[PDB]
């Protein structure tokens, strides 16, 4: 496995082509899109002109290759008919006139056949080699586009949360592969009649009058394969679903290895599974039938068919079967039969490509556009909505303003809004409606470009947190290395799996929800220019007697540094310095004062909350 071959060619071809070619396609298609959505708006029109791969550049070669190949057998016949001639009858001494003398000689024809054969093979191979070199580029483009269109627009998902991995299941490797295959296979559909159509005409031109019958059967033989394909596919799909059931059942069975290893259900656990196999086996038999039949259809109809022509040879009433009359007919029959399988495959490939383009169109027209519209304080905005997704209302007296380095936490889970507010404070949620008025400068992404965060679900990002420590870290980075050596190894000293601390994360198979939240908080720790943003994780990550240890690591991290640390937590176990809080109930920031000033207003919920008894844990239980 040499990587030397790769060189720098991909950058010049695939990296450059994918990004640049579709830029033109987007420019043209969008430019047309402005006129009207009745006819103009579409997706696949741009690619032909924008990529501009000369398919024709090959298509021309493809047509040429088909013509040369179909010509070949007539040259084979030519030599054969003139097997015997003395040809000294006129005592010819005439220099062979180019118009006639050259075509006839037996010797020439053989060399011509060799040249034509080599040329045809070479031209064909080269044309679709270039075509493949273009297909690969198209695939790289399609992938580049799926990521470019998945990154900068679809950040906030509210309905796509029903099936978002369907796209990454189909458009990952079922769509791009389909388009690459369809582009690489178009020339067969494009120039098969130019050869076939030639055969009947050629056969009619030279075989005699039975040629029409002679090729009649194969034109219907091919639809036999086109018909067997669909039934075989249906059987295969049913078999696959049954196989999925078998695999799931087998997974459950092996998932109980210690239970079934010796207990009274040791061999019992496979019982239905065996029938399952047998059940699935039955479907396989059905599928096998069509496949075998299809081969027979592809292995007999030609032979059968050619016999028919010689039967229709008795409809010619000529002198006899001139061996220079039927050998070329058999050659044409054995050459014509090739592109038919390609045509039958293209028949299904077109449907696959159409389905793929429809799925892509649905994705790029399903909230993929419009979900991301186009001490360093930013917020003076009256607009009310601080609601999730494309949700309805809940907008009253909205405004917010917070001097950073303040632990403002809207402690409340009922009518919570903790995720909508946490995402919308940095603007990433569709709550920026109204007027956005900020300072004149950060010292237009809502004057919050210096962000850092933690999620409200287990993150588990690429590789692992041990390998997530890639922030310019050969060994130690002063702000987090210390927390890296001693705050990072604090939550779980070591996982059960081997390798301990180093590269611990890379190939780290699993995690605990407590370890997941600890790792998330740790990735919050190893950030630079620490102005951290947290979203109520410590009502579920409530590790008793370890939440203080995590908060003390963050203490030496943020309360022993010059840094802003915030949180919207829902537990009062960590309510130290919990001065600022909200109980909005479907509103923006409207509750802000001193540590005890809220209790000054003597709100009954505040009065019950602000008591000594366990910080009024569970309303002072």
């Amino acid at each position: 496995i040499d990587l030397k071959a790769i060189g720098k060619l991909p950058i010049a071809m695939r990296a450059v082509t994918n990004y640049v070619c579709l830029k033109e396609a987007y420019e043209e298609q969008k430019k047309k899109a402005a006129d009207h959505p009745n006819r103009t708006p579409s997706i696949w029109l741009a690619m032909y002109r924008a990529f501009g791969r000369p398919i024709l550049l090959s298509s021309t070669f493809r047509y040429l290759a088909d013509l040369l190949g179909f010509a070949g057998p007539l040259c084979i016949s030519g030599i054969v008919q003139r097997v015997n001639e003395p040809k000294n009858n006129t005592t010819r001494f005439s220099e062979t006139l180019s118009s006639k003398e050259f075509l006839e000689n037996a010797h020439v024809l053989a060399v011509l056949l060799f040249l034509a054969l080599i040329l045809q093979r070479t031209f064909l191979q080269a044309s679709y080699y270039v075509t493949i070199e273009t297909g690969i580029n198209l695939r790289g483009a399609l992938l580049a586009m799926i990521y470019n269109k998945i990154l900068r627009l679809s950040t906030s998902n509210l309905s796509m949360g029903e099936m978002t991995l369907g796209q990454i299941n189909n458009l990952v490797a079922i769509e791009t592969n389909q388009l690459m295959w369809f582009l690489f296979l178009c020339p067969n559909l494009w120039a098969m009649p130019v050869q076939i159509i030639m055969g009947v005409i050629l056969l009619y031109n030279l075989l005699g009058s039975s040629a029409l019958v002679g090729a009649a059967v194969i034109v219907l033989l091919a639809p036999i394969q086109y018909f067997i394909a669909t039934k075989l596919a249906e059987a295969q799909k049913s078999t696959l679903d049954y196989s999925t059931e078998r695999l799931k059942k087998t997974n459950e069975i092996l998932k109980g290895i210690k239970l079934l290893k010796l207990y009274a259900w040791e061999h019992i656990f496979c019982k239905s599974v065996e029938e399952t196999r047998m059940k699935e086996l039955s479907s396989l038999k059905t599928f096998a039938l069509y496949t075998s039949l299809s081969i027979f259809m592809n292995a007999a109809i030609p032979i059968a068919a050619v016999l028919a022509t010689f039967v229709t040879h008795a409809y010619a009433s000529g002198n006899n079967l001139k061996p220079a009359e039927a050998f070329a007919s058999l050659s044409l029959f054995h050459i014509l039969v090739t592109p038919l399988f390609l045509l039958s495959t293209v028949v299904r490939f077109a449907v696959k490509a159409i389905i793929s383009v429809q799925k892509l169109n649905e994705f790029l027209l399903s909230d993929e556009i419009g979900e991301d519209s186009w001490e360093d304080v930013a917020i003076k905005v009256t607009n009310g909505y601080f609601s999730w997704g494309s949700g309805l209302a809940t907008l009253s007296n909205i405004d917010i303003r917070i001097p950073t380095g303040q632990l403002t936490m809207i402690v409340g889970q009922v009518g919570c809004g903790k995720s909508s507010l946490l995402l919308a404070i940095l603007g990433e949620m569709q709550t920026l409606e109204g007027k956005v008025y900020w300072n004149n400068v950060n010292e237009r992404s809502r004057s919050r470009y210096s962000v850092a965060y933690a999620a409200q679900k287990p993150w588990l990002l690429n590789a692992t947190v041990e390998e997530n420590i890639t922030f310019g870290s050969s060994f130690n980075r002063q702000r987090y290395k210390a927390v890296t050596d001693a705050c990072s190894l604090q939550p779980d000293i070591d996982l059960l799996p081997f390798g301990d601390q180093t590269e611990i994360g890379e190939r780290g198979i699993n995690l605990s929800g407590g370890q997941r939240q600890r790792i998330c908080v740790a990735r919050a720790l190893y950030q630079n220019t620490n102005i951290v943003f947290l979203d109520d994780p410590f009502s579920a990550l409530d590790i008793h007697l370890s939440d203080h240890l995590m908060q003390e690591g963050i203490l030496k991290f943020l309360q022993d540094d010059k840094r802003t640390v915030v949180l919207v937590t829902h537990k009062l176990q960590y309510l130290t310095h919990a001065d600022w809080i909200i109980a909005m109930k479907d509103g923006s920031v409207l509750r802000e004062g001193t540590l005890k000033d809220i209790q000054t207003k003597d709100v009954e919920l505040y009065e019950h909350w602000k008591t000594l008894m366990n910080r009024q844990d569970q309303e002072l239980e």
Partner: protein
């Protein structure tokens, strides 16, 4: 080791375990490939190719000068004089057939063979008329002797280089580090397969590492030697049975810093280059091996490979790299060296 999986290219391997110098030179002043170079490639061919070039050269020379002779026996009006079948050969005597009884290119070719390889069948001799033929005969013999000599030299030199078969010097695929005689020791095993001895043997162990300097310079691939720890400070070694060539390190050598955890991330690489002249051939040979950080199975100790048979010692070669993991202190490279208050940090 997925990080190493994606790091398969990032690797400090200056010399491949085979021994070659995995490197890359570029931007050099390649003057060209002068003619004589090709001749050197003629010497260093293999038997199948040498035999092919030999036979092809002889046949090409024969055919070429046969074609020349054919032209010569054409121009002198010789082939026609023979073709006149008024008699068996009516007027073929006086016409001074330039080369006697040369009838057609096949016959001329038989004459070429007969005149180059010194056979000389006599039936077809050069005559006293055509000086051009005599010129071509002189040219034939001169070129024949030069080609004969050159091909003989080629075949001989492929014969006189039959002493060389292959270098066979064997290392322990792995290193070993341990504690011996009270202090930390670095080991390695060296063995030989050839019956013949290796005279004036010597070994050298070097550390290759990227260095830094207080003045500010950095030498990217820095090499520094290390002692080979023999009893009287001498890089000599007798090689009858395989042995263990231990370069124990105190302070001057760069092993003071070594910490057991660091070995995975260690950047130092050990290179071993030993050499000597073979007794029965006269050629100076040199064998080199590389000890990368991934192959240094720390803490082990080597096994014993010498047994008393009936009257003569027996020796194994299967157990070369097999080790018994004798317990040893950890990271004592500085702790034991910079002796603590106990002065026995182990």
């Amino acid at each position: 080791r997925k990080p190493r999986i994606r790091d398969r290219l990032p690797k400090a391997r200056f010399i491949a375990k085979s021994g070659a110098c995995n490197l890359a030179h570029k931007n050099i002043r390649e003057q060209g490939r002068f003619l004589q170079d090709i001749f050197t490639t003629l010497v260093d061919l293999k038997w199948r190719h040498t035999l092919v070039i030999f036979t092809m050269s002889f046949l090409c020379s024969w055919l070429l000068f046969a074609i020349m002779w054919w032209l010569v026996a054409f121009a002198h009006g010789d082939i026609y004089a023979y073709m006149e079948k008024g008699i068996t050969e009516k007027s073929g005597l006086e016409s001074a057939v330039c080369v006697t009884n040369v009838r057609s290119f096949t016959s001329a070719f038989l004459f070429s063979i007969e005149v180059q390889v010194t056979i000389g069948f006599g039936g077809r001799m050069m005559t006293e008329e055509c000086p051009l033929a005599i010129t071509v005969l002189i040219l034939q013999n001169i070129v024949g002797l030069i080609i004969n000599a050159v091909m003989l030299g080629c075949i001989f030199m492929k014969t006189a280089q039959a002493h060389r078969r292959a270098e066979t010097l064997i290392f322990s695929r792995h290193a070993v580090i341990a504690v011996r005689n009270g202090k930390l020791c670095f080991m390695f095993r060296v063995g030989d397969l050839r019956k013949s001895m290796i005279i004036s043997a010597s070994v050298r162990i070097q550390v290759v590492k990227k260095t830094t300097t207080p003045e500010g310079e950095v030498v990217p691939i820095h090499q520094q030697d290390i002692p080979v720890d023999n009893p009287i400070e001498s890089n000599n070694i007798f090689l009858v049975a395989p042995l263990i060539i231990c370069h124990v390190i105190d302070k001057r050598s760069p092993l003071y810093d070594i910490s057991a955890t660091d070995l995975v991330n260690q950047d130092l690489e050990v290179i071993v280059i030993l050499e000597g002249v073979v007794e029965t051939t006269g050629i100076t040979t040199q064998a080199r091996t590389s000890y990368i950080a991934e192959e240094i199975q720390w803490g082990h100790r080597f096994v014993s490979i010498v047994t008393e048979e009936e009257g003569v010692y027996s020796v194994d070669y299967s157990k070369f790299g097999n080790t018994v993991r004798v317990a040893a202190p950890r990271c004592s490279a500085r702790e034991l060296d910079e002796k603590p208050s106990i002065l026995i940090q182990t």
